[PDB]
Amino acid sequence: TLKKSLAAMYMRPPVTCYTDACEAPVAMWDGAIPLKETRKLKNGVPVRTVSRTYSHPPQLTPTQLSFNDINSMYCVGNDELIQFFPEGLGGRVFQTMPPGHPRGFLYRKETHLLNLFVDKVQHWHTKRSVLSSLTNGRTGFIVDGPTGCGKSALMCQVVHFARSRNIVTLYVPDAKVWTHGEWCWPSTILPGFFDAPDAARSFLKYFAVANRATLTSWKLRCTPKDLPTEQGERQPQNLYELCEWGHRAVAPASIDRQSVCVKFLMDELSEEKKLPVVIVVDGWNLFSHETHFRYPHPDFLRGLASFNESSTDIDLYPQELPRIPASRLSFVRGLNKMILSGDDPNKFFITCTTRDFKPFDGISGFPNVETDRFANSLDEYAPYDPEKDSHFHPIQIGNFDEYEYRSFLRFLINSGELAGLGWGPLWHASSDFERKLYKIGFLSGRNPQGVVDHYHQELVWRYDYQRTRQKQYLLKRRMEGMSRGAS
């Protein structure tokens, strides 16, 4: 009767933001998230009211984040997420935030360090000496670690920090779409260079809508005034106008405009010396090495009359030409130009390395299409050493420790139950949090991707007898209690 009274008398707290709004009805998380009566002095009299024992982590802006928030969970509003991430998130970052679930992030030591670094970059001319000391003379940092770490999530956090401080930021959430893209096309104005039209058009559109506030104030310094323009369309005087011109076009004319817009945008950024620019590429190891595209067969570049007598084998035997290096891409060329060339103290590359390659451990049969978690994984099988393959300072990121793992798992389980994505009414079917924390830690090894996977895989646990034993014990207790009452 007491629990029924608590559920009936529970009153939902006032909604303050998206994080407070996402909350399932009381009957969903009644058992998963218990309730207790607390005395609150609403009018100086401690009226006893029913309140939850758990709440979603606070939604704290990057400025509000401080040293005391390290190894703790915070949330970002849905509108703030939309405004600051038009391109998207990392390859596997968004898996933990469905529409009902709150968007939450863990504030780690590296996250705090990069947040301070972005704060110093905000006014880079005054803090130039300390920034150079932090990067040891390199043009930014590169995050490296094993598969499953918080690498992509850290890059998303850095983008959030840069966007919240009104800094021009290039974001490539998935570098696979450039190197291992759908198709490749030679550059129209750059001889000997290629590009991926699909990724480039998306990059132009999303960069425009992200920094529209700043790119409109940006003025064109190295850009011709005779750009090809259709009737009724205004000439671009701002960088945002240039980006809109490049991406908003009817096919196939958008291909050539995009190939031109990327070249001119790179020139405009390269000719900037007073504004801090942050460039975040998730998976820079793909740009370091060659792309999966191969050079066209030369017989496609001369024309044939008949296949019989033409000294050609294009139609008879497929052959592998040397793969096109990423350094010949237009986007990559501009990045490499800004890196290798000096006198660029305002551009900082906060990049990362992806290790999402397909597994290969000596023998490789044919993976089952029905069950294969690596359907979209890269077919690289290539070792990568950031020290020898990047000009940036390498930062090594390992798996979660005990504190971060506990905070991450507590957020996942309890926020999911509160949002209506957990056991809910079947809370008693699974063990308590301590058993979950212990068991999942063994299953995953405190690898953040493993933690998420085993959090989902908890549904099929078979050998967890904690709840079954408790049910028998409590039933035995109540049977004895009833017998004592009768006697």
Binding site: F442, L443, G445, D453, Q457, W461, Y463
Partner: protein, 55 residues
Amino acid sequence: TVMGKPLSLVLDNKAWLMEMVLMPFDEANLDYRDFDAHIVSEGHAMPSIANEIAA
């Protein structure tokens, strides 16, 4: 570690197979992260031993 590879990789990160290996450390009321264990395969070697009987 099983045959020089982590248990998660040997069982292909399957919770319903790794929980069987975890069970003795729960029934004995011990801690899994207090002992180093290695498994040596001496029967018929197969590319994948991710199954209930092998577990």
